[PDB]
Amino acid sequence: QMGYDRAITVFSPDGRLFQVEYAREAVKRGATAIGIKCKEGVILIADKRVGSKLLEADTIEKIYKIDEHICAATSGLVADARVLIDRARIEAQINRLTYDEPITVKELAKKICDFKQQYTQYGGVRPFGVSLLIAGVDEVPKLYETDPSGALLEYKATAIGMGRNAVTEFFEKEYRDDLSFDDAMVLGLVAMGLSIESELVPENIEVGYVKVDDRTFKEVSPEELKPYVERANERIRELLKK
Amino acid sequence: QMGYDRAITVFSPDGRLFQVEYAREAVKRGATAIGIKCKEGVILIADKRVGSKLLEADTIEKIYKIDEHICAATSGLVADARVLIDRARIEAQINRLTYDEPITVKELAKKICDFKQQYTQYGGVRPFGVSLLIAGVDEVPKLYETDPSGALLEYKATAIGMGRNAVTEFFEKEYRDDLSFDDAMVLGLVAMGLSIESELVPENIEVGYVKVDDRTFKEVSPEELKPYVERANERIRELLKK
Amino acid sequence: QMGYDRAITVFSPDGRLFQVEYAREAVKRGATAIGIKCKEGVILIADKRVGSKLLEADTIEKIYKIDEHICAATSGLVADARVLIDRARIEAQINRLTYDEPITVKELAKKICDFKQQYTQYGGVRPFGVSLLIAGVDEVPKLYETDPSGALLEYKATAIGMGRNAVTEFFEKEYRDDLSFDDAMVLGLVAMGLSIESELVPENIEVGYVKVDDRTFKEVSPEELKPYVERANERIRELLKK
Amino acid sequence: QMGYDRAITVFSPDGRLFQVEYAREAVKRGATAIGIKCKEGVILIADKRVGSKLLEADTIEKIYKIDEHICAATSGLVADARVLIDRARIEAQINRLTYDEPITVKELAKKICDFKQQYTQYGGVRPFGVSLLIAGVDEVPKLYETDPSGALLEYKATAIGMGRNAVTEFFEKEYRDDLSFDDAMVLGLVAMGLSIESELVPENIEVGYVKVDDRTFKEVSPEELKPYVERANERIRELLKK
Amino acid sequence: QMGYDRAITVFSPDGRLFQVEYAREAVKRGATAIGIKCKEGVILIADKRVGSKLLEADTIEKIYKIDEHICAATSGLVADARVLIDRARIEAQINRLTYDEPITVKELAKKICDFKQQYTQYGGVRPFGVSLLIAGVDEVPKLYETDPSGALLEYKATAIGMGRNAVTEFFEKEYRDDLSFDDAMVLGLVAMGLSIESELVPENIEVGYVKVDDRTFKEVSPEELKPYVERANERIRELLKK
Amino acid sequence: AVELPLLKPELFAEVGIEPPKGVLLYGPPGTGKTLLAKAVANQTRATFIRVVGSEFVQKYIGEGARLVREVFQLAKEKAPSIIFIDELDAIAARRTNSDTSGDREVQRTMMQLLAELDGFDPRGDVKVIGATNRIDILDPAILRPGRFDRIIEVPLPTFEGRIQIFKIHTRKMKLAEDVDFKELARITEGASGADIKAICTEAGMFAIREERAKVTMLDFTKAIEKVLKKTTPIPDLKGVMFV
Amino acid sequence: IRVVGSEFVQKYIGEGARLVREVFQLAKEKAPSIIFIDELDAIAARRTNSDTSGDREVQRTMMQLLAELDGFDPRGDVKVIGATNRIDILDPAILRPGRFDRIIEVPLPTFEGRIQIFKIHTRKMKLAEDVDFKELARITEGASGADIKAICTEAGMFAIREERAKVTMLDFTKAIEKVLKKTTPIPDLKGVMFV
Amino acid sequence: IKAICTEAGMFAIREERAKVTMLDFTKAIEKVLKKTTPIPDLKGVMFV
Amino acid sequence: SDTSGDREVQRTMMQLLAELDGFDPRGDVKVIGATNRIDILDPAILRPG
Amino acid sequence: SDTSGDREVQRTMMQLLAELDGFDPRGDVKVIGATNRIDILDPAILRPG
Amino acid sequence: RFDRIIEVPLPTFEGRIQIFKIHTRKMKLAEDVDFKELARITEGASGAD
Ligand SMILES: [Mg+2]
């Protein structure tokens, strides 16, 4: 400590990589991003909040199209995230080049873990200070989290970002393995309303998703956002009186 | 604090990076440059103040040309800007090569910011310490602030430089998304006059602007800055009395 | 304080390199895996309990295919394991290309040991802070451990991670070289139970095996594992009474 | 101080390379090996005793056939052995590829020294902290030691590793150049036995040789080994009554 | 005092390289090697005693044939000496290859100076620790010294190593410009006996020579050495009487 | 090492051993290095003087030197005498081979330790007992015989050891008989001898807190926790990413 | 007059100068008199800096004693007599003779020198019945006279452990191994790293 | 400031009057600031 | 500043600069100063007047 | 001692410590106190006696 | 704490000349001297020099 944290190469006598824990606090500097997996589809809910009103919020977004049934979200450096995810766009496309068949959500996760690992290993370069939430449906719905080094944990309710700890507590209690896609959409807005610590306005949130039946990406436009948010607000206010 | 500011490959224990913070202080050190977006165009103004008269009265160049409808302006390290804009120029030409279509400001900003992030990755290469405000009209007007950190942020009105903070507080009250083309440039002239806390002459500003109706960048002569400069000077005077 | 672990290139005066003895500590902090050898094949048994129920119950993975007849398990960072397992799979398959014979357990182990040792010598890259277990039957059933040092050690039975020290002592008493396939899987299921200080439920263990007769890797289905786990519970509970 | 010891490029005020000096001590930490030359061939005796009963007693091997007629022992790290020996194996055959003739015991041992000499001069790497004993008969019998430094010293009987100090004292009186092959074999196990200061068992030690009536590496089975270890054990007993 | 032996890209404030001066004090930490030029030949004597009596007489054994008319002895690291010597041998045959001209004693020493100066200037590697006496009759007798750094100085008698200073002082009295082959051979044997503070025996030194009349290397044979021990020792006894 | 020479100088005729001028204690400090020094002092009926190592050096020195002289004088005036010298690292440590500012001070205090140890005649007998953190932060210039003849590895107390120290204290305690000394020891794993002692003081506090004169096994176990047990010592962390 | 001179040099400034003034002055009173100034290594200055407060504080002490020695104030039949471990740490004023007329090299003991030191000390012990002081000298060459004393001291203590209480040749040699480890080890294998 | 005013009044005296005009002040202000702890005079070539 | 081994000797030095030739007249001193180097002496002793 | 200062203080340190020791192996008069610093001074009240 | 902060600088051309005059006056005739030449040689030298 105070020396074995001054490079990505050193270990401590506790055998921690502190540079990698620090790249991870970078994730926690960024705004909350939340994924739910249910058996009828998977949900991606990104914070799309602006902190001043002279900001234009179309590019404060997390949600990036990757493949035509793989979307993903991000938390960490904005910079790190765009270059990383652009790699992932290419990688998903390359997979279609040499096989003629869209990429699996898992393989993409393994490839993008491995990209981050060379940057953790090589001392001449810093790691990407970012985690992804990779959400898609390949034939069967999937939700992954990648860690800054390239570690892989498969989830079923998750978040990265500022609100992560609280969203983890929320799904401990609320998230059940029988929630319909509709039902789980509201529940994931209640999880976002909690972490942001007030009720939500559709302008400060963005929802994207992949359902199993449709097996497409869509993106939820602010008109198509509202019925869900309206349900959500009712309960977001109740948990602010607990 | 120590040892978290002597390299670029190290993070802090909080997920902040103090080296990269200091490049943001680099942006803050230099002269103000304001970009103000409107529905009829996007107006890009940069201070052509000279700290002596021995300095040329048109100092090359506070407002650079990237493409035929794309310009950008600088605050922070002026050394760096020469290099950085050469890259931006070649990037818009490269897209005209490989797609025969000019580059969208959004994707251009991403490319330039990526080149920055690449220079964050390496331990022997420090990043550019300069922010550029890339402005252009592709279909609707667009204004972006590109940071030394590699991150892009879109705006409705913006500032950078040592006048950044003052003009966020100013345009927050005063800006509305319903200014006309003339009303937009005048309000931006008021913002420049506030920041420097003296009146404007056509010799301490360089203005260009971009029309939707022409889809082209045009560069404003000192003669035709005169009407706008006089109208604006009244509001500035009232602001420097209170 | 030392600085005999500033780099991997600085020996301690005692004649040891500290930095790989801390990459050895990286394995311990990660979770346990046990590889258990009988005279009728090999068994491989690994943690999947990880975290609360937010994480998927059948989270992927500790028990990796290398081949369809050689399998591996890890302990340490599952970043350094994930790219290493990518490297392993290629390595076995290159042997298959150029020999049209499957890699022997011993020979795959030797190649992982060189690979690890490549990173260990240069100061410009750190070695993995991961250890690997390589289990097969080439035609003699075999069990090895490949160290983060890139050293090769032959084992009758072996364990790594948190439970390393408990499993060792436990097998010092009970294990024999003439245990049946049924006995050796079960024996290590008690030991695995002791490693986490809890009863084994079939949803927090992934167990694969390589049989001598088939020479084909097969993974134990949740409920096919259930009666083997059930017989282990009697002894694990018994022993947690003390 | 003392040193000037955290670089490999630095020679200290002593005029030694501390780095290199730390690595001769890393040989010692590795298990003993005993080399002995007679006029009827060259016997190499090597410790294959590692671990309790967690590990298998056969642990590869540790007395590697390098060439047809040259074998070597290792002392130091096993990890260090793997890589130095991989390269060593290739070099032995490389001579045969380009000349179609025997590699010299002198010449193999020099180019095994050379690989690490590369890693001693250069700044980007460490030498391996390993000392191999290089024993064979190209046309006369020879024994050398290769040193982690890269020194090449012809011995006539010696030890290195843990037993280095112990066996020199032993061989001041015992070692003679009119000894028999059989006498040498036995005397070399007494030396090793002294190193461990314990009773031998023929199952956890491997003895191989290159004769001069063969000119081929051979290895003496454990069924054969028993009488030689048994006449050793009397002589260990005399010594451990003093 | 300093900290400029920490680099080899530096100069100190007195304009010196202390790294090079401790590579100088690696030579002084090796056993001596002596050269004598007479006007009938040139004769190079170097220690061949090393270690305990359990190391062959013929363990280094320094005075390597480089060419047909050039032998070169060493003092310093027996590890770096070998590589240099091999590089010296290659440079001399390259000269033969490209000219069919046997390389001059002078021009060979020059090419060595330049080779070691690449390793002095570059900071990613270190300077050698070795001093060589390059010696022969090209068409007149020559003896040079190439230094740790690679400085070329011409001598008419020298020594290098631990024995160095005493033998310099000796020559300052005895050495005469009128010297002959027999006298010289005797002279260097006397000189070697002051270094070691003890008598010489035949095989505990090796001596190489290049005559003018042969203009070809011949090694002094042990039996030919014998009458020279007996006459040299006369003076040795006298000068080791205190 | 010390004792038997000092009381019996017949030894310096029967053997002819010239007087020992020093003995050095190593292994972990605070175990009871001070206590060992007193134990000896009692046996030869000598004058114990304790010098703390923070009495040596300031930041340009004078007063550091002044007190080495002071206690060398008291010891000669009060012979036989035993000077306990905790803790060698501020008056005996390794030197710089290329200067630094800080070292200079340290060296000037040092030369005066080195001198006086050799300086005594058997006219005035000054025996000393050193103690340190380890010997691997110490120069060999004082670890020369006649500056430090021999060394004593004083390690941490053994399992069976902790029991015998617990027993010293249980004596004092009123109504002690539910005490298992072995279990208490087990729990106080990797505890020094000083630690054992602290626990005993605190068993008495715990007991009076429960308003009784009896100190058995609840009290003692609670004491252990307060002083010794506050640690898990190598666990942490399970990822996230290290899993 | 035996002074350890490093023992002075007080941080209460000039108290330091006083003390050397008085010892010198006393030398003239009790003349003829020998003053022994032990380690001129901290009572002798150096004009090249290493401690801003330290160089000047020693200097005042140094030029004061020089003042009394033959600065203007007469020698007083002194007869200094003075010991030091370093020579390059010295000011030009003291380094020269005429304040120490005969500069003497005191080297480490020779082969014959080992023997002499050995004899003086074995007379204090119980000798050997196997005496050879030449045999001991071969290993110990390259040590100092204090290590010779050290060996002796170890042999007598060794004898106690052995329960002999008699010193002999066998104890002397064992004492050489133990002493030589600590503080002047001499054979060490240089044919490993070096040629 | 107390120094600037005394320096100025001494300027007024130098010009042999008691009217402390703007010009006595300007000379004075430059005298007192020239001495003092630090006023701007460097702004870089890489910054404005 | 902030020493006593090279602070106190400087305020008795400042007294000297300034007593040896200072305020006070003349007399018959003529102060014979003697030194070993002029390379570690204050520039006031070094100069004439 | 630097004559006046040191000796008065030396005396009042010793006079403080002997009493407080001597009436309390055990409670009789309980001594309480405070200090703001103790790293600044020679052991005395850092002496474990 | 003063207000009138006066830097005493080294002598200037005209500055040296005024001083020479005083000393010559006390020191009788020296009319073959050029005061200007003395100043050119002694450029930037102190008053005490
Ligand atoms: Mg002395």
Curated annotation (Swiss-Prot), chains A, B, C, D, E:
Presence of keyword Cytoplasm: yes
Notes on how activity is controlled: The formation of the proteasomal ATPase PAN-20S proteasome complex, via the docking of the C-termini of PAN into the intersubunit pockets in the alpha-rings, triggers opening of the gate for substrate entry. Interconversion between the open-gate and close-gate conformations leads to a dynamic regulation of the 20S proteasome proteolysis activity.
Subcellular location per the Swiss-Prot or TrEMBL entry: Cytoplasm
GO CC terms, sorted: cytoplasm; proteasome core complex, alpha-subunit complex
Record key words, sorted: Cytoplasm, Proteasome
BP-aspect Gene Ontology terms: proteasomal protein catabolic process; ubiquitin-dependent protein catabolic process
Entry's family note: Belongs to the peptidase T1A family.
Record-given protein name: Proteasome subunit alpha
Originating species: Archaeoglobus fulgidus (strain ATCC 49558 / DSM 4304 / JCM 9628 / NBRC 100126 / VC-16)
Swiss-Prot record, chain K:
This protein's name: Proteasome-activating nucleotidase
Record text on subunit structure and interactions: Homohexamer. The hexameric complex has a two-ring architecture resembling a top hat that caps the 20S proteasome core at one or both ends. Upon ATP-binding, the C-terminus of PAN interacts with the alpha-rings of the proteasome core by binding to the intersubunit pockets.
Domain characteristics, as noted in the entry: Consists of three main regions, an N-terminal coiled-coil domain that may assist in substrate recognition, an interdomain involved in PAN hexamerization, and a C-terminal ATPase domain of the AAA type.
Record's subcellular location: Cytoplasm
Domain of life per record: Archaea
Role noted for this protein: ATPase which is responsible for recognizing, binding, unfolding and translocation of substrate proteins into the archaeal 20S proteasome core particle. Is essential for opening the gate of the 20S proteasome via an interaction with its C-terminus, thereby allowing substrate entry and access to the site of proteolysis. Thus, the C-termini of the proteasomal ATPase function like a 'key in a lock' to induce gate opening and therefore regulate proteolysis.
Binding site for ATP: H23
Lineage, opening ranks: Archaea, Methanobacteriati, Methanobacteriota, Archaeoglobi, Archaeoglobales
Region of the whole protein represented: 302 to 350 of 398
Family recorded in the similarity comment: Belongs to the AAA ATPase family.
